[PDB]
Copies of this chain bind each other. A is one copy, B any other.
Amino acid sequence: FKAGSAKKGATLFKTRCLQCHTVEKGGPHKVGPNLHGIFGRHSGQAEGYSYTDANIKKNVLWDENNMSEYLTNPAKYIPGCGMAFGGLKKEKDRNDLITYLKKASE
Contact = CB atoms under 8 A, between A and B. Distances in A.
Interface residues of A, number: 23
A57 to B, nearest CB: 12
Q: What is the oligomeric copy number?
A: 2
A20 interface: yes
A50 interface: yes
A49 B78 contact: no
Contacts of A79: 19-20, 30-31
Nearest to A21: B80
Interface in A1-49: 19-20, 22, 27-31, 33, 48-49
Interface string A60-94: 00000000000000000011111111100000000
Contacts of A84: 80-82
Interface of A: 19-20, 22, 27-31, 33, 48-52, 78-86
Given A19-B79, A30-B52, A31-B81, 12 more contacts: A28-B48, A29-B48, A29-B49, A30-B49, A30-B51, A31-B78, A31-B80, A78-B80, A80-B84, A81-B82, A81-B84, A82-B84
